RNA sequence: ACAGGAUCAAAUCUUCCUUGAGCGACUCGACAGGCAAAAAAAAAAAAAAA
RNA sequence: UUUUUUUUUUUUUUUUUUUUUUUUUUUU
């Protein structure tokens, strides 16, 4: 309910194309979530799920 | 008259030359600030925006009671200004001992009005909480009512009989003490019940004739 | 700037050329303009939050004596050892305890540790190891503004004695803090004293024109002294001081006497620091009145020299930043698309220069060799040969001045003292010659170019060539010999002799340049004028042209032959490893000019030998020469029919701006 | 830091040195220079909670309304409330947001404290507080709070410290009855506490006994109503009363429990924050909606004896 | 900290691993402030310069 | 201008408000 109402329209439309629930499939290992979806998921659970990037680094001469 | 005089060049070519340098330095500083801002934002996400409101903090000043008071006064100023506009009538000049007839609404829904008449007894002079007290008698029964000056309910205000005279102006003015004798406080000069006998003064306030 | 450093790091052709260690100089810096700085004042509030809670007399840190080279004794039994200790060691061992002259004298009669060379009983030892005069003065920090000048002057009169650095550092700092309280005139004297302390006993570059003081005999066969600690590469004055002091002068520029202005310009020049604001302000004040006349001959030269030295670099830097300015600007994609669619020396005021010229002209006889040379060489920088711009009148004035000076010159009066001084005098004479040469060329070119559309210099010029020929011949024999490139176990090479050798070679190159230029100058004379001009331009640019002839010299032919013989003799016995980089082509050109209608000079010139040595140098230094020089050489060699397997290899396989075009 | 008599004259003479009142506008337009790039609209959930705010007590005032009923309202000013840092379960172990308020002279701030401010890119702060909220309402660092967070006509939870009255007696603190002024009463008995325990059966005084001591200086909480707000000056008018001195720090949050259930049910509120759209104007001043029924209506109440 | 390491090797902008949880978080290293004068309901208000 | 009820406001939170104490330191 939270994710569905948060995701943009493009993602929302695809969310409705899955044969069943996306959460259950992700939990069960029968579906690979997108970056966008993952973002929302992590926002809900209040904990990162995967090693995120770190946009920082000193250019070496 | 901005700064002390300096022995700077005045040739057009020299000034144009200087301008270039100025421009260059400006550009450089802009670019560097942009770069650092970007970097910071990218890394940490720290943002430093412009002020959104007028606050002492903006001005880099502490919070003081003085400031508080200032603000409070300003708010009353603005409120007065705003309220003045809504009215459809001009308040006439009056004073103590002047017969007046006030007209005010009772019930907006019911359209019930009210008209009071009485002689001025008191005019409490303030900023926003100013009021006037009216007294009258009906069939031998005396009634008294105080009405604020600034009220949206006041339909109308008129004066039936005035008493223009210097006596009213005297009452309508804040007088100053004649002398600093008031500090004497004669009312405090008393004698204790249990205190030693000092003259022929009974317990209580003393006398100044002797 | 990150991209700009990466390009320099990735560059395979850019290098730091240096014939000698002393040639290198501190980098040029351009100071900005002053402006109100409210933020710095607010920051200063955070530096004095606990001053009420600190010492009221000595709140600043305490100086530390320099450390020793080797570690101290294990047990630190310095007193028991009985060996003499330096001032810093005694200071550091006695807990940095003051040793007034009486106490030191009493202790020296009881222990031998205090009987050291720096432990002067009549001066004492300071807290920080100060001695020999500095120990008798109080801390610079504690001295009032009004007593700074006297303290510095008294101190100036005072790997040994390493403790003076602390005192001078303190002084430097003090000056900066008390800048805004001292007299404007006293400030200049303080800066000059600091510069003297920081640059005492130094040697100027070989290719440099400007110099603070004149070299003189000092009471080694050559008599010259060198030291890496006092290398000219070292900046006397920190930029901070100058930056801070900049504003002061702007406010009270009208209160500075001509002697103070000359010293200020010299200090700036010595420091290598520049300021547009200041430069322009000084330029726009002084002028000729029918006042520059107040300046004395000694101060005038220095003031001119400094200004020129600074201005040259200023302009140079301006030019450099102009091009870098392009990339900082943003370009939109629409501009890109539109562009795609579509694609389908003068660094002197006229008035100032005129005034200078007039000044020189009017008091030619009052000048000395050094001053005159210095002044002349500076002003000749603007005169070029490509063709605001100075006037013929202005140039004629300077020419006349030169002539007058030459006529009135005695020609040496010190009885031929130290060899370094004699070499410096020879180089100054060569400079003079150079100047003389350039003036004529400018005048002639101007006249000849202007005529198409619609002073006896040589008589005075002739003497300098003879004097140089005699002096170079004498000094070559008087100087000691050294090994040659072309031909305990270690070759004895004293660095102190190569300096004077390079000075002599630079003077010779100067003369060779001058005599070369004179040829063009003369040849410009009335073939059409336009054709003549074209010919001269070809010659200067290094292009295919007519063979150069020597007869055009006329009266100067004998002097040119004598000069060629002198340089041939010098190079036949001293190689070509000390020649300047910026005047290499001229030395080649002069021999090509000499090779004409010859009778016997063909055998001495090969066509070890001077020519061979020159070639050997060319080949060696091919990685440093400019495209102009390279083309000039390429043509010159051809002219003379000089065949060299080595030189021809570099002339056609190691450059793209000459070989990859026809 | 002057004398008593200098301060007293100052107190009186201050009135003569008041700057002129500002000019208040009717409309406000915001640009991209006042908006956090990282700020976005987030849909709420069943277990989502918002953040609080800090304010300074200025003073009381009386204001009318649409029906003409006068009400007493306290004025509060948010002194540039800015987020400093955030807390995460992974990092710290709990979700929270740290905010700052006030201004301090640079000649009073310690170096370690200044190190934080340099990082933060914000002027020195007087006070720092923290709020616990849900993970889905974590505001970006550097975002400046505004008075628009609370909509007029909603219930608010206000917390702050009470005033100080020094030492007080039993009769003064608690409000004891005491004894009569007459009828043969001892001097000491006038204001005595009386019995303070039981007989030998209970040889110990029960904890938390009402006795004499220093009064005041305690935490207190109260409900308030949003009456009016100002965007220009960042001002909020709260209906009711707020403890603490005229300048003391006060915390404001949303309703909790019954207060929320009964009042704050049908009131649409911007959960995360106020998110203005570039290129659109907003009101400066917002007033509380009037009631439905006529307040000035006195119906008849039958009084029948039985 | 993009600090270290592997690979027939990554969109601009690190594919993946190590740092026990990069010392609870930030920051400082001449850091920090007890007492005195003056002021002083809690609290706040003084840049240094005899 | 201050104090007070004789005036005004609330009657909500309790994993809340608040606080004197960072703890891999098993012989300071």
């Amino acid at each position: 309910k939270f994710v569905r109402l948060n995701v943009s329209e493009a993602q929302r439309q695809e969310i409705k194309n899955w044969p069943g629930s996306v959460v259950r499939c992700i939990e069960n290992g029968a579906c690979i979530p997108s970056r966008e979806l993952q973002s929302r998921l992590e926002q809900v659970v209040g904990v990162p799920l995967t090693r995120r990037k770190k946009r920082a680094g000193n250019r070496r001469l | 008259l901005l700064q002390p005089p300096q022995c700077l060049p005045r040739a057009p070519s020299h000034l144009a030359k200087l301008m270039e340098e100025e421009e260059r330095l400006r550009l450089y500083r802009h670019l560097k600030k942009e770069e650092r801002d970007a970097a910071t934002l990218n890394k940490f996400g720290i943002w430093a925006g412009e002020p959104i409101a007028d606050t002492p903090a903006a001005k880099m000043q502490p919070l003081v009671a003085r400031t508080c008071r200032q603000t409070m006064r300003h708010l009353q100023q603005i409120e007065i200004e705003r309220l003045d506009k809504q009215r459809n009538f001009q308040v006439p000049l009056f004073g103590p001992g002047d017969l007046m007839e006030v007209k005010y609404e009772l019930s907006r829904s019911q359209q019930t009005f009210a008209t009071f008449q009485g002689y001025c007894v008191e005019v409490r002079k303030k900023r926003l909480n100013s009021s006037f007290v009216l007294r009258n008698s009906y069939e031998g029964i005396g009634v008294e009512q105080r009405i604020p000056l600034y009220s949206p309910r006041i339909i109308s205000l008129k004066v039936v009989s005035s008493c223009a005279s210097p006596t009213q102006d005297f009452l309508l003015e804040r007088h100053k003490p004649l002398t600093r004798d008031y500090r004497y406080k004669w009312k405090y000069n008393f004698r204790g019940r249990w205190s030693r006998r000092i003259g022929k003064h009974k317990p209580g306030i003393r006398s100044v004739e002797k | 700037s990150v991209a700009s450093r990466i390009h320099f790091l990735n560059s395979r052709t850019r290098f730091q050329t240096a014939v000698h260690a002393s040639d290198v100089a501190p980098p040029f810096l351009l100071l900005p303009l002053a402006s109100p700085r409210p933020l710095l004042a607010y920051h200063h509030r955070f530096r004095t939050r606990n001053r009420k809670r600190g010492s009221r007399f000595h709140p600043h840190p305490l100086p530390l004596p320099p450390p020793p080279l080797s570690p101290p004794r294990s047990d630190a039994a310095h007193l028991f050892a009985g060996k003499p200790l330096a001032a810093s060691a005694v200071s550091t061992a006695a807990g940095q305890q003051t040793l007034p002259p009486p106490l030191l004298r009493h202790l020296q009669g009881l222990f031998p540790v205090f009987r050291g060379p720096e432990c002067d009983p009549s001066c004492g030892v300071g807290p920080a190891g100060e001695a020999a005069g500095l120990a008798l003065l109080p801390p610079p920090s504690l001295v009032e503004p009004r007593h700074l000048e006297d303290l510095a002057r008294r101190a100036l009169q005072a790997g040994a004695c390493k403790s003076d650095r602390l005192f001078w550092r303190e002084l430097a700092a003090r000056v900066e803090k008390v800048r805004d309280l001292l007299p404007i005139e006293s400030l200049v004297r303080l800066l000059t004293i600091l510069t003297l302390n920081g640059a005492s006993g130094t040697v100027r570059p070989v290719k440099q024109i400007f110099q603070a003081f004149e070299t003189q005999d000092e009471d080694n066969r050559t008599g010259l002294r060198l030291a890496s600690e006092t290398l000219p590469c070292v900046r006397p004055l920190p930029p901070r001081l100058l930056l801070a002091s900049t504003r002061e002068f702007l406010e009270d520029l009208k209160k500075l006497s001509p002697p103070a202005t000359a010293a200020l310009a010299a200090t700036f020049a010595w420091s290598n620091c520049a300021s547009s604001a200041l430069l322009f302000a000084l330029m726009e004040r002084w002028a000729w009145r029918q006042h520059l006349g107040d300046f004395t001959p000694a101060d005038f030269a220095l003031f001119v020299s400094a200004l020129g030295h600074l201005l040259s670099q200023q302009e140079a830097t301006h030019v450099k930043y102009s091009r870098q300015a392009r990339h900082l600007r943003e370009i939109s994609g629409k501009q890109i698309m539109a562009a795609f669619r579509e694609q389908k020396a003068w660094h002197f005021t006229a008035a100032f220069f005129d005034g200078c010229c007039r000044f020189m002209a009017t008091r030619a006889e009052s000048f000395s060799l050094f001053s005159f040379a210095s002044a002349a060489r500076t002003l000749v920088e603007n005169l070029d040969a490509v063709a605001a711009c100075p006037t013929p009148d202005s140039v004629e004035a300077l020419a006349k001045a030169i002539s007058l000076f030459v006529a009135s010159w005695d020609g040496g009066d010190k009885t031929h003292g130290r060899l370094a001084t004699r070499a410096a005098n020879l180089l100054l004479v060569a400079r003079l010659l150079r100047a003389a040469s350039q003036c004529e060329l400018y005048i002639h070119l101007h006249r000849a170019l202007r005529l198409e559309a619609e002073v006896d210099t040589v008589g005075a010029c002739k003497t300098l060539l003879e004097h140089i020929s005699c002096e170079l011949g004498l000094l070559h024999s008087e100087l000691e010999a050294l090994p040659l490139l072309n031909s305990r176990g270690f070759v004895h090479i004293s660095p102190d002799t190569v300096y004077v050798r390079n000075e002599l070679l630079a003077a010779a190159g100067e003369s060779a340049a001058a005599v070369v230029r004179l040829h063009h100058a003369k040849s410009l004379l009335q073939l059409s004028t336009g054709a003549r001009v074209d010919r001269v331009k070809r010659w200067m640019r290094g292009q295919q042209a007519e063979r150069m002839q020597l007869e055009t010299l006329g009266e100067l032919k004998s002097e040119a032959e004598h000069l060629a013989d002198a340089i041939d003799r010098v190079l036949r016995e001293r190689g070509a490893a000390g020649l300047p980089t910026e005047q290499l082509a001229d030395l080649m050109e002069v021999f090509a000019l000499c090779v004409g209608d010859k009778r016997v000079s063909q055998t001495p010139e090969e066509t070890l030998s001077s020519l061979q040595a020159l070639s050997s140098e060319i080949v060696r230094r091919y990685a440093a020469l400019d495209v102009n020089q390279k083309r000039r050489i390429k043509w010159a060699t051809r002219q003379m029919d000089w065949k060299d397997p080595y030189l021809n290899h570099c002339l056609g396989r190691f450059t793209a701006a000459v070989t990859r075009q026809r | 830091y002057d004398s008593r008599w200098v301060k007293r004259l100052d107190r009186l003479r201050e009135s003569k040195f008041y700057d002129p009142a500002p000019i208040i506008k009717e409309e406000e337009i915001l640009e991209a220079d006042k908006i956090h790039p990282l700020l976005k609209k987030v849909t709420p959930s069943w277990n989502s909670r918002r953040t609080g705010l800090l304010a300074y007590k200025i003073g009381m005032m009386s204001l009318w309304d649409g029906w003409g009923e006068r009400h007493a309202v306290t004025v509060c000013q948010v002194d540039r409330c800015v987020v400093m840092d955030q807390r995460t379960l992974d990092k710290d172990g709990y979700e929270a947001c740290v905010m700052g308020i006030g201004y301090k002279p640079i000649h009073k701030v310690t170096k370690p404290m200044l190190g934080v401010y340099i990082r933060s890119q914000i002027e020195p702060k007087s006070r720092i507080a923290e709020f616990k909220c849900s993970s889905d309402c974590l505001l970006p660092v550097g975002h400046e709070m505004s008075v628009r967070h609370f909509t007029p006509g909603q219930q608010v939870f206000v917390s702050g410290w009470s005033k100080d009255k020094g030492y007080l007696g039993v009769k003064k603190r608690w409000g004891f009855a005491g004894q009569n002024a007459s009828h043969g009463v001892e001097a000491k008995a006038h204001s005595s506490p009386g019995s303070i325990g039981q007989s030998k059966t209970v040889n110990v005084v029960w904890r938390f006994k009402k006795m004499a001591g220093h009064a005041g200086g305690d935490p207190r909480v109260v409900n308030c109503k949003v009456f009016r707000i100002e965007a220009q000056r960042n001002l909020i008018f709260l209906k009711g009363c707020v403890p603490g001195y005229k300048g003391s720090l006060i915390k404001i949050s949303d309703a909790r429990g019954k207060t929320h259930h009964r009042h704050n049910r049908h009131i649409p509120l911007h959960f995360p924050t106020f998110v203005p759209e570039p290129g659109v104007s907003y009101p400066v001043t917002l007033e509380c909606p009037d009631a439905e029924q006529d307040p000035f209506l006195y119906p008849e109440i039958a009084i029948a004896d039985k």
Side-chain angles (χ1 to χ4, degrees), chain D residues 11 157 161 165 219 221-223 239-241 251 256-259 262:
Chain D
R11 179 54 261 279
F157 179 87
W161 297 76
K165 304 211 173 184
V221 296
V222 75
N223 300 319
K239 198 218 169 196
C241 176
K251 293 172 179 172
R256 315 176 181 180
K258 309 178 197 176
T259 47
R262 289 197 280 273

Side-chain angles (χ1 to χ4, degrees), chain C residues 16-31:
Chain C
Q16 192 66 15
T17 314
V19 179
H20 200 246
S22 60
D23 297 336
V24 71
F28 181 73
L29 297 173
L30 189 73
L31 316 173

Side-chain angles (χ1 to χ4, degrees), chain B residues 3-6 8-11 14 17-18 21-25 27-29 31 60, chain C residues 30-33 36 42 247 250-251 253 276-277 280-281 284 315 318 321 325 328-329 349:
Chain B
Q3 283 192 357
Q6 304 188 8
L8 275 159
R10 294 183 179 180
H14 301 169
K17 293 175 183 186
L18 303 156
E21 186 182 292
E22 284 296 325
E23 183 173 332
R24 288 191 285 277
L25 291 163
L27 191 61
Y28 160 79
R29 277 171 59 80
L31 299 169
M60 310 178 77
Chain C
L30 189 73
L31 316 173
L33 189 60
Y42 188 73
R247 188 174 168 171
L250 290 156
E251 284 193 45
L253 190 70
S276 308
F280 310 145
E284 286 183 26
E315 283 280 55
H318 295 161
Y321 297 164
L328 273 68
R329 300 156 188 159
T349 320

